[PDB]
Design an enzyme around this catalytic site. Sequence first.
Site, PDB file in Angstrom:
ATOM      1  N   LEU A  16      17.732  30.966  15.012  1.00 21.07           N
ATOM      2  CA  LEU A  16      17.076  30.196  15.906  1.00 21.07           C
ATOM      3  C   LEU A  16      18.229  29.350  16.887  1.00 21.07           C
ATOM      4  CD1 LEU A  16      14.003  29.197  14.027  1.00 21.07           C
ATOM      5  CD2 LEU A  16      14.007  30.957  15.849  1.00 21.07           C
ATOM      6  N   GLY A  19      23.763  24.260  15.965  1.00 18.60           N
ATOM      7  CA  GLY A  19      23.984  23.002  16.528  1.00 18.60           C
ATOM      8  C   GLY A  19      25.477  22.773  15.987  1.00 18.60           C
ATOM      9  N   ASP A 123      15.318   8.162  17.129  1.00 19.65           N
ATOM     10  CA  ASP A 123      15.371   8.973  18.381  1.00 19.65           C
ATOM     11  C   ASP A 123      14.342   9.988  18.723  1.00 19.65           C
ATOM     12  OD1 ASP A 123      16.683  10.537  20.435  1.00 19.65           O
ATOM     13  OD2 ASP A 123      17.586  11.725  18.923  1.00 19.65           O
TER      14      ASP A 123
HETATM   15  C1  LIG Z   1      14.614  21.038  22.639  1.00 19.83           C
HETATM   16  C2  LIG Z   1      15.796  21.694  22.114  1.00 19.83           C
HETATM   17  C3  LIG Z   1      15.618  22.440  20.805  1.00 19.83           C
HETATM   18  O1  LIG Z   1      15.051  21.803  19.817  1.00 19.83           O
HETATM   19  N1  LIG Z   1      15.555  23.835  20.810  1.00 19.83           N
HETATM   20  C4  LIG Z   1      15.977  24.370  19.560  1.00 19.83           C
HETATM   21  C5  LIG Z   1      16.899  25.360  19.660  1.00 19.83           C
HETATM   22  C6  LIG Z   1      17.164  26.477  18.729  1.00 19.83           C
HETATM   23  C7  LIG Z   1      16.362  26.029  17.614  1.00 19.83           C
HETATM   24  C8  LIG Z   1      15.428  25.099  17.404  1.00 19.83           C
HETATM   25  O2  LIG Z   1      14.851  25.190  16.138  1.00 19.83           O
HETATM   26  C9  LIG Z   1      13.748  25.556  16.232  1.00 19.83           C
HETATM   27  N2  LIG Z   1      12.689  25.565  15.287  1.00 19.83           N
HETATM   28  C10 LIG Z   1      11.617  25.925  15.173  1.00 19.83           C
HETATM   29  N3  LIG Z   1      10.627  25.754  13.958  1.00 19.83           N
HETATM   30  C11 LIG Z   1      11.142  24.801  13.150  1.00 19.83           C
HETATM   31  C12 LIG Z   1      12.311  24.249  12.722  1.00 19.83           C
HETATM   32  C13 LIG Z   1      12.055  23.278  11.647  1.00 19.83           C
HETATM   33  C14 LIG Z   1      12.968  22.373  10.951  1.00 19.83           C
HETATM   34  N4  LIG Z   1      10.701  23.632  11.103  1.00 19.83           N
HETATM   35  N5  LIG Z   1      10.086  24.464  12.061  1.00 19.83           N
HETATM   36  C15 LIG Z   1      11.223  27.195  15.893  1.00 19.83           C
HETATM   37  C16 LIG Z   1      12.138  27.183  17.046  1.00 19.83           C
HETATM   38  N6  LIG Z   1      11.901  28.220  18.054  1.00 19.83           N
HETATM   39  C17 LIG Z   1      10.903  29.214  17.799  1.00 19.83           C
HETATM   40  C18 LIG Z   1      10.057  29.347  19.053  1.00 19.83           C
HETATM   41  N7  LIG Z   1      11.130  30.137  19.917  1.00 19.83           N
HETATM   42  C19 LIG Z   1      10.279  30.536  21.543  1.00 19.83           C
HETATM   43  C20 LIG Z   1      12.274  29.263  20.541  1.00 19.83           C
HETATM   44  C21 LIG Z   1      12.767  28.672  19.187  1.00 19.83           C
HETATM   45  N8  LIG Z   1      13.395  26.432  17.119  1.00 19.83           N
HETATM   46  C22 LIG Z   1      15.219  24.236  18.479  1.00 19.83           C
END
Ligand SMILES: */C=C\C(=O)Nc1cccc(Oc2nc(Nc3cc(C)[nH]n3)cc(N3CCN(C)CC3)n2)c1
Length: 254
Positions: A16, A19, A123
């Site tokens: 996903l 970082g 944060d």
């Molecule tokens: C605002 C910046 C940001 O946080 N972007 C981001 C980029 C890449 C990965 C993520 O994490 C991410 N997490 C989830 N779900 C999740 C994380 C945890 C812990 N628990 N649940 C979901 C997603 N996405 C799914 C939806 N798509 C459309 C994009 C990414 N990203 C955050």
Amino acid sequence: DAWEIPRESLRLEVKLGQGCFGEVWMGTWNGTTRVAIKTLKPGTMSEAQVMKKLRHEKLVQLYAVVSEEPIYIVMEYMSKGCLLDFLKGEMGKYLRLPQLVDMAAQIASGMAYVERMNYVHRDLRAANILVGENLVCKVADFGLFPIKWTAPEAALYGRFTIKSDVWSFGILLTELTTKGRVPYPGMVNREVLDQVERGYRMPCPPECPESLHDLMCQCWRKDPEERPTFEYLQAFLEDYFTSTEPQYQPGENL
Ligand SMILES: */C=C\C(=O)Nc1cccc(Oc2nc(Nc3cc(C)[nH]n3)cc(N3CCN(C)CC3)n2)c1
């Protein structure tokens, strides 16, 4: 611990993000359960006991772990990702004031629990809130400059409290009401530092009721202890459209 799991029970299906500290994945756990999996790069560090013993409907739940390197953290899965990206993208377009205020009420409620538990987030902002189906929003990223979201006491004199989080919540309210714009448009960090010290505050965003801006301005009081609690913020947002804005009528963007 009963929380520690076997390495074979986790299928890492979709990467996903990536970082500084590792990666994040959508996955499966025991072949049945959808999960998010965070990966710590070995060498980066070596708390989830805390996170086990922080349970709330509006906090992303820790499900399981793998405590010997390389570390895997298994978590509740928030399907829609980042609140900031959700606000800017194709879903921004249709969110109106009742959906956004309800969203704010959820995050208040997660922050009210953090408040009861005597914790500090440090944060709070739309980038660190996760969205799921049916506009469910949850506080995430408790264990990790965003000076635009950080109260003066905290940015200046490292005084981080639940009242500095309230300040960040006022800033988050502007993110919601502007579909995710950066606060203090056109201002750089030092311009912001200098201005908020001298009494400057963001004005009412376009179409945002004045009663809400008022709430934002209570969150941005100079004196940390004059700012409301999250128990107050939650209750006010929950009851908003009966008690405060009973004559709300839809507009172009809010
Ligand atoms: C605002 C910046 C940001 O946080 N972007 C981001 C980029 C890449 C990965 C993520 O994490 C991410 N997490 C989830 N779900 C999740 C994380 C945890 C812990 N628990 N649940 C979901 C997603 N996405 C799914 C939806 N798509 C459309 C994009 C990414 N990203 C955050």
